[PDB]
Write a protein that binds this ligand. Structure first.
Ligand SMILES: NC(=O)c1ccc[n+]([C@@H]2O[C@H](COP(=O)([O-])OP(=O)(O)OC[C@H]3O[C@@H](n4cnc5c(N)ncnc54)[C@H](OP(=O)(O)O)[C@@H]3O)[C@@H](O)[C@H]2O)c1
Ligand SMILES: O=C(O)COc1ccc(-c2ccccc2)cc1C(=O)NCc1cccc([N+](=O)[O-])c1
Length: 314
């Protein structure tokens, strides 16, 4: 139920996602998650709910439901904080909100640095994102310092393409390799090339939006729906499981970590009940065959950013 990272720590392969979890609901969601067995929570400063996630974590620690060492808490450095001198403060704000004295894993959220400031998405008057002149290798060195100062146990990356991963791996004077690359992954975006690349370098992959993020705010009614794909429903029926349970088990059997999001107690519990069955080897190849290179998480305003990750094949 845990996977070994290249920092020597073990990471639970199932975690709770928190993007779009409303601040007034996420405390209860995280409490319920911990009660039913979740030990890994995926967070981010940009999700604007870390204070409320932290309330839940703290209550369960205080209640003696779980020990801190058994929890695996992940957060992410937002794009406006890539400048080397801003990284520590960004991490400390997240630690303060989460009410923790360390993170288990801290990720560079996107490879695209944005202009520093209060706004999370600084745009020019024509709607293009305003970049920062930061070198991601300098950002990485700042992340490495967080490990040395004890603020985080592991560091990693998210939404990095293989060339960008390679840039880090080839960084002059590299001190800590990324432990994790967290990327979008599901049957319509199977990511075989990038996953094999990362795994071959000892980097663990976390699959985000495993259900296709049906609540993403930019969703359109005509968009494909994993949860309603009759082929996936058929596999679920064979196992007497839900389609969501199949979608969660799928990345687990590829040696990935997976972080489905819910604020619905029944679904939070349902999503955790994925250790009592196995997809067959043929279920796995068949689910892989559904790849469409359909990506739900990207921003048009970032497509001209020199570090936009999704122009490359992988
Ligand atoms: N690093 C990054 O750039 C990045 C990008 C995207 C996501 N992420 C992380 O990955 C997490 C998961 O991705 P996501 O939030 O995009 O989407 P997701 O986990 O694929 O799907 C979440 C949606 O599915 C619904 N749902 C959950 N369980 C269900 C079930 N058993 N049956 C039916 N519907 C169910 C949720 O509804 P309810 O909540 O209403 O129950 C919500 O609308 C995020 O929350 C975040 O932590 C990271
Ligand atoms: O980033 C996540 O974890 C989930 O997406 C969001 C999650 C949250 C929010 C958010 C929006 C407004 C206020 C606070 C948060 C946005 C977004 C969002 O659009 N993300 C896409 C994105 C981000 C950065 C760079 C690129 N890119 O280079 O293509 C794409």
């Amino acid at each position: 139920s845990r996977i070994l990272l290249n920092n020597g720590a073990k990471m639970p392969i199932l975690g709770l996602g928190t993007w779009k979890s409303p601040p007034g609901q996420v405390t209860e969601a995280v409490k319920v998650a911990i009660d039913v067995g979740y030990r890994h929570i995926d967070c981010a400063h940009v999700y604007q709910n870390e204070n409320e996630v932290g309330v839940a974590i703290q209550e369960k620690l205080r209640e003696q439901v779980v020990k801190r060492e058994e929890l695996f808490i992940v957060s992410k450095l937002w794009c406006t904080y890539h400048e080397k001198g801003l990284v520590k403060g960004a991490c400390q704000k997240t630690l303060s909100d989460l009410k923790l004295d360390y993170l288990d894993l801290y990720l560079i959220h996107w490879p695209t640095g944005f202009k520093p400031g209060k706004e999370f998405f600084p745009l020019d008057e024509s709607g293009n994102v305003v970049p920062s002149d930061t070198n991601i290798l300098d950002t990485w060195a700042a992340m490495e310092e967080l490990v040395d100062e004890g603020l985080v146990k592991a560091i990693g990356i998210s939404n990095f393409n293989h060339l960008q991963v390679e840039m880090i791996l080839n960084k002059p004077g590299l001190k800590y390799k990324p432990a994790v690359n967290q990327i979008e992954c599901h049957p319509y975006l199977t990511q075989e090339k990038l996953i094999q690349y990362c795994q071959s370098k000892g980097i663990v992959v976390t699959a985000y939006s495993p259900l296709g993020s049906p609540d993403r705010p930019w969703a359109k009614p005509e968009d494909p729906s994993l949860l309603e794909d009759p082929r996936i429903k058929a596999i679920a029926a064979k196992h007497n499981k839900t389609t969501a349970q199949v979608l969660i088990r799928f990345p687990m059997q590829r040696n990935l970590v997976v972080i489905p999001k819910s604020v619905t107690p029944e679904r939070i519990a349902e999503n955790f009940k994925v250790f009592d069955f196995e997809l067959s080897s043929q279920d796995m190849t068949t689910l892989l065959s559904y790849n469409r290179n359909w990506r739900v998480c990207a921003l048009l305003s970032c497509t001209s950013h020199k570090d936009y990750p999704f122009h490359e094949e992988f």
